[PDB]
Design a protein around this ligand. Structure first.
Ligand code: NAG
Ligand code: NAG
Ligand code: NAG
Ligand code: NAG
Ligand code: NAG
Ligand code: NAG
Ligand code: NAG
Ligand code: NAG
Ligand code: NAG
Lengths: 109, 122, 123, 124, 121, 122, 109, 122, 109
């Protein structure tokens, strides 16, 4: 599993960053670190794929990057409609295909 | 697109349960698909992955000898046959599109589409 | 030579001399006749090698496959086939199913080879 | 589909009929010589193709993967266009000028790999 | 170096030009057909021989036949660093068929052994 | 059919002992054979398996680097070379016929014949 | 290893069952669960092979079956001559090869 | 024969240092080479081995995901590119010639030449 | 790794033996057991390679042998200049290429 903060917060209009860390064999070596946004009662939606790319239909508001063995999601114009549990996942090579972190509860002040 | 999971929701420990997933709105045979579990009180965990043609299957070690993942490209359906279910297997089982590649197309290593999930209680 | 010495042996007593038979496969009108015989022998050899190749059996004499045996082709156990029968009798017994088996072998290699390409595309 | 039936299909639609074309490569003294020349030529062409597959480390396969990276200078296209839009005839035209370069690299990578294998079954 | 360029090089100085030489193995006009047909048969016998030894598709093939010191009691440095392939061919010509026979038997045993390991389940 | 074990005796820890088995009443070269241990006060433990031709040998991990199993089809015998004996190797060693297969005959995965056993005390 | 009852008993004329359990990768994966009858002081005799088959020379009083990860040996007309330690074994894949359980002491009243 | 290490000194923990070794007095391309650690107050530990041609590299498990060994036969040099540099790494790093041969020459499995050693402090 | 005595001693002119022990999967399975002599502050020098051979330039006072899982270095005409840390090493297979023992301090009396 990846280490990920249990919660982050900020006021509307403020940016926030959610980070996840792992090791070199998974998040470090492979540039396949997607992010998912899960609203309560719903399945997670894909927000970020690979490292920086977003699916069509996702606004610029969401972006991300990685350095070393740490990946992060940046949310710029934070809205109240973003209240969701955010998750990291990463490809960890053959044999261990995917590793997920714990969720980050995003609280909007 | 649509992904609709069906199947039963309650077994006793040691029993078996089969889940299925109907996909629509895209060419089924062009994407690999997977099953991902969410514990009732925690986060997401990947459980199984099947190739777009159904020839190659991969499992998380905790289920490697117990779960079978199957694909039928003539019905646009998935199924997951879980044997010897334990209390630790209670979860919402989501049907998802993505997770692999087919060598002659750009890789994914991410999940493009999600269903709503079947809840399985042991 | 030893060529065809095992012809009267049982299937499980034979199939140990495969290299013995394998190595025995290799005035204008006389020259033409000899060239036609030599070219034909070469074409037959290459067709058999190509056939083994497309089945994923290139370079082998005893090649294991992933095609299940159908009871409709020969409803016999291993003791009768390998300890009692000869290869000539077996060839007669399943002649009518030879092309069916060959087709299945080709298909299983096509699936296996593609699957390997996909496994090698991970990471 | 039969022989060359996939010729007009896309590259990813083809590359599943390789055995169909592969099986069609092998099969009054002046008429004798003319027929012999046709048969000998077919045999020699087949063997040269098999020799190239051999020295590249692809013997016995119709599809083989290698360790030679693709250069963007040969064809600056992604897999979606090459495999889902293009046909093999168009592809052959697009990289004709680089065929021998690729072949040389394939030969060189096998030479290194084969030696590398020899130096590992030597340990112990 | 080109075809046969390494002929005077030491055994370990050659063994890197194998593809160069491998590429060169492939009415009155009947003479040409005879010449062409012979080349094909000779090529195929060598490929067939490699096949029965389990060396198909390779230019360098390692085997499980021990080297007998009676064939050549040298120190490897003598063979690969000083000697050429022509001198070596002369030195062990008398034992070539013995080695070939052993190689064939070795592969037959391995092929049976492989089969015996592929119905364990 | 008869299988008669020989060798045995008391060897101090760190020593070496050779066991052997003479077979009769069946074609020796047609069957795979094995050695099985029984602890003086407990049940049976499989130790080593050899094919009918003798080219393939398998060992239980606990002896994999210490025991060698060998067969001589011209004498109708089995042998076991036991090095670096430890107190845990005290047992009755039975010679048994069966266990493996030769691919071209029906499988066994069971032991058809048993000897009387050699007693090894460390 | 497999688990068997330390001992069982029954009437000299009523049936008895000796259970054998393992895991999904061995007894639950292969239909190769033989049974042996070892009289004290003697080498074990083969009684059952595969799942239901018996060797020639063995009476029809010895039979057995398996379901899931559980196998059992059934003895019908239990005799005084059946007092032996019974063992189950199983093929455990082309790595482990064989596993055995402990002996079940069959007591004849 | 000379082997001289000029790789470096101290780096902050969780940092990347690159060691290098210049060789002279022998044909560089004919010998395999390795890096061996001498703990500040304990014994020797092997870290990595590279083949004479540079195509094959081997590492000790404790550094496998953090060290890269490289060789350049046109400069008569070795290098070791270190990334994680955890505290355990601290040692004198010796450049050595030997550790393997090349199938076509007599075996080694020993180290023929040693340099003086770079002191790498975490 | 390998077990080696912390120290050995003897008077000048007397022989000494430095033992090294391991297990049956490495020092007792491969005949590649070299010995090195390291003076404090200096790089180690190769003294013994394989089992019995020494490099050219090393005197015949240093010899060695192996039996079972034990190897040893024998020094005959012990000299004052032999006060060094001696190390044993062994090839341990392709998975673990080399293992070393700790050093033996040779004290000259
Ligand atoms: C022919 O049959 C007899 C039957 O007794 C057998 O002994 C002999 O070996 C057989 N020949 C061959 C070549 O197997
Ligand atoms: C055997 O072939 C028949 C057709 O002749 C087919 O119906 C049957 O399903 C086949 N069985 C197997 C096991 O392949
Ligand atoms: C093959 O089919 C023909 C009928 O077309 C039949 O006479 C012959 O016996 C068959 N051969 C076998 C081996 O079944
Ligand atoms: C020819 O192109 C059409 C699409 O325009 C396609 O549906 C058809 O399959 C192609 N032909 C072949 C042989 O693939
Ligand atoms: C690609 O080809 C160009 C020549 O057109 C060459 O300069 C370049 O180095 C090549 N790159 C690779 C990665 O082969
Ligand atoms: C090959 O090179 C020639 C110039 O010599 C150029 O005209 C032609 O278009 C090139 N072909 C391709 C496919 O790039
Ligand atoms: C010929 O021999 C000389 C030494 O006498 C050597 O330097 C040279 O490289 C050799 N030729 C070839 C092609 O190796
Ligand atoms: C080596 O060859 C000699 C002469 O043929 C023979 O007597 C000897 O047994 C052979 N030894 C081996 C190990 O092949
Ligand atoms: C080969 O045999 C001949 C005798 O026929 C002998 O004169 C020659 O020396 C032999 N060569 C070797 C290398 O043994």
């Amino acid at each position: 599993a990846l280490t990920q903060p249990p919660s982050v917060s900020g006021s509307p209009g403020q940016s926030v960053t959610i980070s996840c860390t792992g090791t070199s064999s998974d998040i470090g070596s492979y540039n396949y670190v997607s992010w998912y946004q899960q609203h309560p009662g719903k399945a997670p939606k894909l927000m970020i794929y690979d490292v920086t790319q977003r699916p069509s239909g996702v606004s610029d508001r969401f972006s991300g990057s990685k350095s070393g063995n740490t990946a992060s999601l940046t949310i710029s114009g934070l809205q109240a409609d973003d209240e969701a549990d955010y998750y990291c996942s990463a490809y960890a090579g053959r044999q261990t295909f995917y590793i997920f972190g714990g969720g980050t509860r995003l609280t909007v002040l | 697109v649509q992904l609709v999971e069906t199947g039963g929701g309650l077994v006793q420990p040691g029993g078996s349960l089969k889940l299925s997933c109907r996909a629509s709105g895209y060419t089924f045979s062009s994407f690999a698909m997977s099953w991902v579990r969410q514990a009732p009180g925690k986060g997401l965990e990947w459980v199984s992955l099947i190739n777009d043609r159904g020839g190659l299957t991969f499992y998380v070690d905790s289920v490697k000898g117990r779960f079978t993942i199957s694909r039928d490209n003539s019905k646009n359906t998935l199924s997951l046959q879980m044997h010897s279910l334990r209390d630790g297997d209670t979860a919402v089982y989501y049907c998802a599109t993505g997770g692999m590649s087919s060598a002659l197309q750009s890789s994914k290593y991410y999940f493009d589409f999600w269903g709503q999930g079947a809840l399985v209680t042991v | 030579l030893g060529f065809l010495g095992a012809a009267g042996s049982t299937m499980g007593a034979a199939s140990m001399t495969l290299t013995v038979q394998a190595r025995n496969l290799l005035l204008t009108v006389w020259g033409i006749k000899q060239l036609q015989a030599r070219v034909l022998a070469v074409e037959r050899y290459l067709r058999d090698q190509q056939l083994l190749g497309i089945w994923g059996c290139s370079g082998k004499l005893i090649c294991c496959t992933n095609v299940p045996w159908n009871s409709s082709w020969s409803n016999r156990n291993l003791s009768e086939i390998w300890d009692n029968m000869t290869w000539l009798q077996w060839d007669k017994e399943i002649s009518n199913y030879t092309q069916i088996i060959y087709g299945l072998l080709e298909e299983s290699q096509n699936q296996q080879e593609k699957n390997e390409q996909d496994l090698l595309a991970l990471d």
